[PDB]
Amino acid sequence: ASAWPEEKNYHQPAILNSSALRQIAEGTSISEMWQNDLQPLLIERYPGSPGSYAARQHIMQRIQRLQADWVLEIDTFLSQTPYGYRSFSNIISTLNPTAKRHLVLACHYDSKYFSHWNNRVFVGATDSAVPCAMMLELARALDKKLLSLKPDLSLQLIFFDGEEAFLHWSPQDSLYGSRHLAAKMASTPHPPGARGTSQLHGMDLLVLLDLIGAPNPTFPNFFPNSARWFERLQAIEHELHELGLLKDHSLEGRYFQNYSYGGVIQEDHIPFLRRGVPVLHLIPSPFPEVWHTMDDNEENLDESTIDNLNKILQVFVLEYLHL
Ligand SMILES: [Zn+2]
């Protein structure tokens, strides 16, 4: 009876030295992400809408153009909603599908449904078009390093559909894509042929990005079983800062601060956390002031903060994967 699902408990990062940190800082481009990955997603994209299809095609196309061996799968399902039965499609992008373990980065790509108001349209820029673009930029920036994976451990990106409630939050009306996918992964043997382990046992850590893009975010350390990885984000932030690799940044105004958070936040990690998956939830507390308003738009995004977080995230991922 292999103990491989316990490996994640002892897994340590392979820390990057100063020269490598400068390389990562120089290898990501916030302006290229902005134009090529983010702007195409700043459209109305609630589930089942024409924009939802356009956002999915954009995400799939940007991944497909990369050199690394990404395997794309669309998880399409039906769910009851306040508006009746509807179809949803989660996007899963995986390197080394048969590898036993994967570090997983995730966000939701749907935008909350609102009828147009005074000619304004809700596009959910921080919620979560920026997180989606950050994941696409990370795949692009780290492409040459990721190509080398072609520790039986690799990387998977998940873009959930239907995270938002169609009305206001309720247990049945929200998290459509993550409740579906967590249940599906929980009942899928992994690796192929396994007798008693599932895809969820293979998820080392689920790093969920949500509501990112506003100024001065503060991310609390929510869970004790991922606290040591939260500490790594703090250390990476501190060292990139000391190396002069972050922009418009101070340690007093650091993003990853020492402090827990006892409450529960309804978000896509919930169905995974309730099935025993370790989660590192990168959602700020408090939420962006523009949360769920028409002002959650491009103009209110903080470019340097997103750039700094791209650098921190990319370093975290390379160190976790020993790349
Ligand atoms: Zn939202």
Distance, in Å, from the CA atom of 32 to the CA atom of 29, rounded to the nearest integer, reads 5
Q: Phi-psi bin for 211: left (phi > 0), alpha (psi -120 to 50), beta?
A: left
127 C-alpha to ligand 1 centroid (Å): 5
37 labeled part of a ligand binding site:
no
What the block records as the tokens of 57 is: 């095609």
State which H helix or E strand residue 279 sits in: strand 279-282
User: What was the resolution (in A) of this experimentally determined structure?
Assistant: 1.7
Residue 65 has φ and ψ, to the nearest 5°, of -75, -10
Query: Which tokens in the block code for residue 209?
Result: 């990005």
DSSP letters, 152-211, are: -EEEEEEEES--S-SSS--SSSS-HHHHHHHHHHHTSBSSTT-SS-BTTTTEEEEEEE-S
Q: Is 292 marked within a binding site? A: yes
The rounded Å distance from CA 174 to ligand 1 centre is: 10
Domain CATH for 300: 3.40.630.10
Among all residues, which ones are annotated catalytic? 163, 210
Range of the domain at 274: 1-323
How far apart, in whole angstroms, are the C-alpha atoms of residue 246 and residue 22? Answer: 10
Q: How far is the CA of 108 from the centre of ligand 1 (A)?
A: 9
Look at the chain and report how many structural domains it folds into.
1
Residue 97's contacts (CB-CB under 8 Å, 6 or more residues apart) are: 71
Under DSSP, is residue 316 helix (H, G, I), strand (E, B) or coil? helix
**Is 164 annotated for ligand binding?**
yes
Question: Helices then strands (H, E): number in the chain?
Answer: 10, 6
22, with CB counted inside 10 A (0-12, 13-18, 19+), is middle
Residues 6+ apart with CB under 8 A from 156: 92, 93, 94, 95, 102, 103, 104, 105
